[PDB]
Hints:
The structure is a homotetramer.
Chain A: H1 2-8, H2 12-19, H3 24-65, E1 78-79, H4 82-102, E2 108-109, E3 123-136, E4 141-155, E5 170-182, E6 195-205, E7 213-224, E8 230-231, H5 234-270, H6 273-276, H7 282-305, H8 312-329, H9 342-376, H10 386-397, H11 402-408, H12 412-415, H13 417-453
Antiparallel strand pairs in A: 1-7, 2-5, 3-4, 3-5, 5-6, 6-7
Helix pairs in contact in A: 3-5, 3-8, 5-7, 7-8, 9-10, 9-13
The structure holds ligand EUJ (4 copies) and N-octane (OCT) (5 copies).
PDB class: membrane protein
Keywords: Ion channel, membrane protein
Assembly: tetrameric
Amino acid sequence: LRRRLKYFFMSPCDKFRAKGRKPCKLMLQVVKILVVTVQLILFGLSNQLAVTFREENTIAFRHLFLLGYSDGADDTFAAYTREQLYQAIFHAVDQYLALPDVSLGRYAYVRGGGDPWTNGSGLALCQRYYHRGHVDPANDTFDIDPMVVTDCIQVDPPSYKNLTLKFHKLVNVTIHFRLKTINLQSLINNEIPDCYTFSVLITFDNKAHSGRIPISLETQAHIQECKHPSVFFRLLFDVVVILTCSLSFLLCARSLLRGFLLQNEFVGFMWSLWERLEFVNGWYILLVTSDVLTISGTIMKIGIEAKNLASYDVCSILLGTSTLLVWVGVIRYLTFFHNYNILIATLRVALPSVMRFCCCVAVIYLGYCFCGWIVLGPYHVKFRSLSMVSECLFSLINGDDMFVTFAAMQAQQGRSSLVWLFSQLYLYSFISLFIYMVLSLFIALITGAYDTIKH
Amino acid sequence: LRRRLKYFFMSPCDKFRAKGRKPCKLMLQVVKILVVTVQLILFGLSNQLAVTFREENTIAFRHLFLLGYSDGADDTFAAYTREQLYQAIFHAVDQYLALPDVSLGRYAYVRGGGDPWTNGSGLALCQRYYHRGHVDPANDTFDIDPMVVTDCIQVDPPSYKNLTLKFHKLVNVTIHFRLKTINLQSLINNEIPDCYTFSVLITFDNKAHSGRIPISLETQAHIQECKHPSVFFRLLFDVVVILTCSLSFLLCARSLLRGFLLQNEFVGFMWSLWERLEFVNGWYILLVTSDVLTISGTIMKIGIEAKNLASYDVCSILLGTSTLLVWVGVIRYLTFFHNYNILIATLRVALPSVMRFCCCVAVIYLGYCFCGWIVLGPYHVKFRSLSMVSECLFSLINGDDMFVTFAAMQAQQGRSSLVWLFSQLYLYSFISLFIYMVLSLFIALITGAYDTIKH
Amino acid sequence: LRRRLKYFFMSPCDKFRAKGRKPCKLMLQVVKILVVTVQLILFGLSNQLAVTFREENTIAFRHLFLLGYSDGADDTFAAYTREQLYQAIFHAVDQYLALPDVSLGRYAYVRGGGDPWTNGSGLALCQRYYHRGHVDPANDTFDIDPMVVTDCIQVDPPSYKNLTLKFHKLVNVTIHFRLKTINLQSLINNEIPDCYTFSVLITFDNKAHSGRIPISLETQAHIQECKHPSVFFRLLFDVVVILTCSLSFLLCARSLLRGFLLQNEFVGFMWSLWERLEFVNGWYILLVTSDVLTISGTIMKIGIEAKNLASYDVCSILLGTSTLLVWVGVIRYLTFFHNYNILIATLRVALPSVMRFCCCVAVIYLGYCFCGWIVLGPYHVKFRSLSMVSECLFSLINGDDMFVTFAAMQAQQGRSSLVWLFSQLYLYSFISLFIYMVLSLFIALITGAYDTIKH
Amino acid sequence: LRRRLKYFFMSPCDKFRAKGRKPCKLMLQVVKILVVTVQLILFGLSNQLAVTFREENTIAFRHLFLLGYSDGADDTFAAYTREQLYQAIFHAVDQYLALPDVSLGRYAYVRGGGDPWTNGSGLALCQRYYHRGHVDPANDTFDIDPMVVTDCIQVDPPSYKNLTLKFHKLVNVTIHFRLKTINLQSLINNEIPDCYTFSVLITFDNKAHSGRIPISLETQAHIQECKHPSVFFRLLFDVVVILTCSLSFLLCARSLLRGFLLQNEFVGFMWSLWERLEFVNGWYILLVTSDVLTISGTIMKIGIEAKNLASYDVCSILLGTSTLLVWVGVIRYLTFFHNYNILIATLRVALPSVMRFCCCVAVIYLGYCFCGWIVLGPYHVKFRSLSMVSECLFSLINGDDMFVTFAAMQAQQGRSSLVWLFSQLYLYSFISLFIYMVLSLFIALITGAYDTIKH
Ligand SMILES: CCCCCCCC(=O)OC[C@H](COP(=O)(O)O[C@@H]1[C@H](O)[C@H](OP(=O)(O)O)[C@@H](O)[C@H](OP(=O)(O)O)[C@H]1O)OC(=O)CCCCCCC
Ligand SMILES: CCCCCCCC(=O)OC[C@H](COP(=O)(O)O[C@@H]1[C@H](O)[C@H](OP(=O)(O)O)[C@@H](O)[C@H](OP(=O)(O)O)[C@H]1O)OC(=O)CCCCCCC
Ligand SMILES: CCCCCCCC(=O)OC[C@H](COP(=O)(O)O[C@@H]1[C@H](O)[C@H](OP(=O)(O)O)[C@@H](O)[C@H](OP(=O)(O)O)[C@H]1O)OC(=O)CCCCCCC
Ligand SMILES: CCCCCCCC(=O)OC[C@H](COP(=O)(O)O[C@@H]1[C@H](O)[C@H](OP(=O)(O)O)[C@@H](O)[C@H](OP(=O)(O)O)[C@H]1O)OC(=O)CCCCCCC
Ligand SMILES: CCCCCCCC
Ligand SMILES: CCCCCCCC
Ligand SMILES: CCCCCCCC
Ligand SMILES: CCCCCCCC
Ligand SMILES: CCCCCCCC
């Protein structure tokens, strides 16, 4: 039994020396790295085509329908007078009606299809306002029934000029319409073009009632297969990836079963879950997981190519994660040699103490996150949301973007002095505590763990 | 006595094992974290509403009243010819008079109310100039009585076109007026809208007499309750926070009193203030402070909701600081376990030596701050004020924004060669000394303290 | 023999003390540093002249031929309506025909010379479109023969107004023409001006068929000697550099041969390639390589000055690399003194373990590179290409540009939520793993190697 | 003698305990810190006034005289057609002639005064071109006599419209004129306004002959006292600073002389320059130097206030350096206590080895500097000059601005592939070598020196 247990833990070269076993798993891992990376790149081609089509069409729509729009002005684009708002709305509708004659793209109109469009209508121009809206700031009085009423005009593609906005109680104005187009660029990749429907929403937002009405344009893209198109090997490569991953999965499962049987035999011999897991090859669990991910991604990719699916983002995430895991999994074979296994050995020795340290660090980090989000968020562009606050604080710990973070608050030193002083204390204390004390101890734990396994 | 002293320092689990004592303080701390964080977020809703109203109205005013204004031009917006200045002033007054017909917001005029407005006047257009201003650069002569004289025209809301500026002795021009509006967006938060009065000041500043007159717009917002408004549970949550913090305060005070009595008993037994403080639970002092802060913030928040107060910034600071302290205070219960107490133990061992080191470092840092502020401030945008200089130097020590700091002075290499050379020496010496020597020793002190408590 | 072997490894001062040998190699190295650096600067003069001529002419062309172009708009310059595209094309052609009357430069036309120009034609205006292009998004149909057909109009320098674009199947439009000019600024450097031919290509790109057609201008510069020009010592310096490098090469070769003979004698005496290489002076191999590079660069520079060559970039790379190597090569003489040889000794002790560590780190780095390139590239401006991804990740490891990397993805939190979440996981995991664990161990290896050679 | 030698090295408290000596030097140092800092701030007031006047006038001139100028366009402002250049030149001259009627500042004209102005002339409009300029790119020929000829038109303040530019051989065009103004803002600081003469030079530069002519405006300011001005305590503070610094200088000189006498006595007793310098108080040499600097700066400041001098920059440098040295000099009294003297002790132990390390590092750094400056300078905005290259590399070593440095070269990956590849190798090798190996050893030396003096 001792001989078999010793053999179970021998390196591939040692196993070959002992029993002459050939290292098929290693060759399979190398082949998998190659083929999976190539497959990821080949998929990225079509993924890029789709993403580019969507974004370029959206930019073209912004230039066509938003009056006076220029690149880079999305965050500040707004109207400030009644005349500006009327001109913007009428320009959008007029451009919609003039699209066939002026546009560089070829678009088809969509009619009906439920709310907000009536039958035969292509464009819906709807204004939303309070049901009762008497507002008298001169007398410091108001009488509001805040139930929202929607009044919407229908425009058929080739009376909206009579639009009368209820400015004092206006909640917002929206323009909805759909356009159909064809993604011809797919031909460059030897693929059949798809049929895109863009749902375009233009919003003039007055929910702040502040005298400034921001204007935005958004799109939703729906991809469908076209009807009987005419155009005057990746599938084999996908099948090859499938076969390679299936064989790797089978071999890893066989190894895991053998390890489980050996574990049972050893436990019986001794007549301790931590000692039990010494027979579990975590690398092979990772390999099996990566193989499942790769096969799922390949099936999804084939379905997308066959026009049965259009979930490009899910496929890309699956294939990219599988590629990263496939590259990582080859480190299993450097673990047998000490001089090539410093990183994994240090990880193994250091992880527990690092987690125990993080237990204490996390409460402080979260307290700072919440405090900054709520107190500074209204004044600081980097504290608008909780995820943004976490990104800002994490970057600060790494010494990144410090001065601009300080400078964003310099504008408040005259307006809100107390908030400025609080921001000074907040930023200085956080930076000092986390850079010079928390991170120092984190690195000290890691390097001490390294010192433990050095020899 | 020895048994009681030993019990006083036992961990909550150990105390429960000994006497069966239930850990009510721990559950209270967890509940407090939850409820205080939720309360902070709920307050942040209305705080954001108020801040957004103020800033959005100010931006709308800049777009309405400043001729040719565009976003991002605040720091350079200026006039350069007499015609430009006259056009800007007349545009501001004309827009003020046209506001009801053009603006997207609904504003009411304010009349009278003391200086600078006379009775019945809504807008004050005042120019300030030297009492005697004979200036003759051709003969290199001047005769100045620099007492400032203010001549101000009054405009009633729906003769200012006869304004004649004394350019050669003009100190500045100002336009003052007030507008009333209602913050309707509060309805979205189930709150009654408040009545805002904006005091708008437009400044055309000629104090430099340099041929360039910068133009700025500032606002002051005063919030008041409206008279008999009509609109067709947070209070219980605030009460819950109050009760939780009061109970925590009572328990912490009881523990502190018990510790004080035990301290007195021990001192009597021995028949040393540093040894005396071993009976003071600093965590409980922090908890009591945080409870006082939370109760004060909650009372202020309730008063604001009842329309008795409008100090949003003070309330936000109180509640955010209390939230951070509440999150921090839970570390008291990790202090009993060595593997979870690395940070606090290292802090305790390291703080004195770090303070002694800072004693020496501070004089050098302040010398650099003053030197840079006065010598480079006129030439470097990052050295304009003392707080700005401190932020810049602190960011440099952390390696942030170094190259742009160097590059701002590259424009002086042709104009002011000596100042450029001095800036080179200043920056290089500061960066080298503080990054490679001061900070190295700081981190060395902290990690040596860690090494002392490692085992 | 032992005496001779000991002498072979003595320092220059020790060798002078023993045999009175003069250190000609050291003086040669100092002289080489001086002369090679001076030569590099003198070459940089003319290299700068050439590069500046090319870039300034290209900018002038962009301002002359692109309608409505402004500096900084290269990456967004595009047309969005048919009228805009026609106006841009006609403006380019009209400016080409008006060049002699409006331009600040003096340009000559080029006619004929093969495709795309016919005999006598100076400008080629060609549109490329699908051979069969029936596109019917209304019926979700298309019939495409995607073979590209080029129809191109010829314009002679002083019918193109009848251009009719086939928008629905348009692949792109191009304008090709060549201009001749003379680089007069060379006179300031006491050099004969060269004759430049600029090949200008203007592209209106519709390969995306997205309704947005980007517009770009590119140039290729060909330098030729002019015919019998009239204009009413660097060569000696180049010869001096040649002689210095040749003498250094001869001395280094002599030393290497002597070392080889001593190695053979020692091997014979002992009656081990690693022990063999102890007789190889790597510094002298570096010196010989640098001398070859310097002589090659000097010959290329002389050829360029004589107008036989125009490969400025190759010459600059050769001379700059040789200058860096010449500066580095003087460290050979600090190796004899321990207190001046810390860097090289640590390098020698540390390189093997660092390479073994990199073996493991590289697979993880490459997995991350591929995953990020394919998954985030379509959404993140910093992940567009593989080299860009490597630059971004390498900068992140050094803590640079972290927050903007996070912020570029905040625009996707609303559009593509899943891709945003994946980017969060990707960035956080990469930064943590590589900054706090991989780099820590890298630095630990280097400083441990230093500790080994410290005394 | 041993008692006296022991006393000479006792701390101020120890000296007071022994002989009752009062610590006048310490109180003097504190008083000096206070008064010198206050004096620096008070001077900074007037220094800021002068600098602001100059810069604001220059900006106003750019807006007045440069046609179509806008803020932030200095680096790209240029003409591209003959019509643009003529319009710019005529606009500048017309604005000069219209200044009294349009400008917001009050300016006086200056006439005559030597070249380039003739007697009675206020504006000089001069074009410079080659003496013989036959240029024929069509025939690839030219005949150049490159001697520069200047033809200059004189305009008297209230024929230049007949300007005919020789475009094909034009070297440049310049406009020179002078304006007198008075810095009235000084009144706010209770100072008599000075009389400024601005020498304005507008350059239209065609030295590249590239079809793009950049346009720039520069000013030189000369300050003179005005003649018999009329306007309807800092001097005592300066005198106080003088007295304090003189007394400190006297005491430091007395201490240095006493130390010298004790050194002579000890040397005589022993019957070694390094041992000799143990009697030299370097802190007192620093104090004497700082006192000399402060007195010189104070005298210069008084002279400036009396209108005898106008060298604001020299005075500011003197006073700022003296302030920094005065703040630093107080560390002399923390050297007696070990826990407060870590920084200086580590400096003393570490400086020699650090210098020996820098001996080797400097040659590599300089090689990289020269290589980058000459090879990448024409392509990279951060490598234009040698000082800029040093700043860029120094910032890179500190991990600052890495990604933008990489990204500036991404534009060359298509144009100049070889230069892009070289830049990749250059940047990667420099960053790796200097961040991970050179800086690691630098910090290791410093922390090892700290370890030597730790106990
Ligand atoms: C008897 C049990 C049930 C039936 C099992 C049938 C198994 C079968 O046939 O092969 C297994 C090997 C495994 O190949 P591979 O996985 O590379 O190699 C195995 C591993 O080295 C394993 O150790 P770990 O790597 O540490 O887990 C070791 O214990 C096994 O020997 P051992 O059994 O003496 O302990 C090896 O056979 O793989 C082939 O031989 C090529 C297959 C593909 C050929 C076509 C490729 C296109
Ligand atoms: C006799 C002295 C005067 C009267 C004192 C009356 C006190 C009373 O009634 O309770 C005290 C406990 C304290 O609860 P709590 O603070 O969680 O627990 C105490 C602490 O563990 C303390 O140690 P430190 O934590 O290290 O300071 C320990 O010394 C006390 O036992 P000891 O006295 O034997 O030393 C404990 O009782 O709290 C409740 O029992 C629940 C109260 C809220 C219930 C309703 C919740 C909604
Ligand atoms: C006999 C073998 C064949 C013929 C060899 C003829 C050689 C000849 O003539 O000179 C060699 C020396 C070398 O000068 P240089 O290279 O500076 O000096 C040699 C090196 O120091 C070498 O050690 P490493 O530096 O560690 O390799 C050492 O072993 C040699 O001594 P050794 O000979 O006893 O072994 C030295 O001669 O250089 C001149 O003497 C000036 C030449 C230029 C003068 C004009 C300048 C404008
Ligand atoms: C006999 C030799 C020639 C004549 C010397 C006349 C000197 C005189 O009068 O005072 C010297 C002291 C020095 O004051 P101060 O410099 O603060 O103190 C001296 C230092 O502590 C010195 O040691 P270091 O600091 O290490 O160099 C020490 O050796 C001297 O005593 P010692 O001589 O026994 O060794 C001290 O007198 O300063 C005043 O007493 C106040 C003066 C200003 C009062 C007005 C202030 C507005
Ligand atoms: C040998 C199994 C333990 C290490 C886990 C490997 C997967 C990261
Ligand atoms: C146990 C009291 C000493 C530690 C103080 C805790 C508050 C930060
Ligand atoms: C040193 C023990 C008491 C510390 C109390 C400070 C709490 C903020
Ligand atoms: C003495 C030869 C070994 C060191 C190599 C030097 C070249 C980098
Ligand atoms: C005591 C003299 C040696 C230290 C020099 C102090 C000046 C920096």
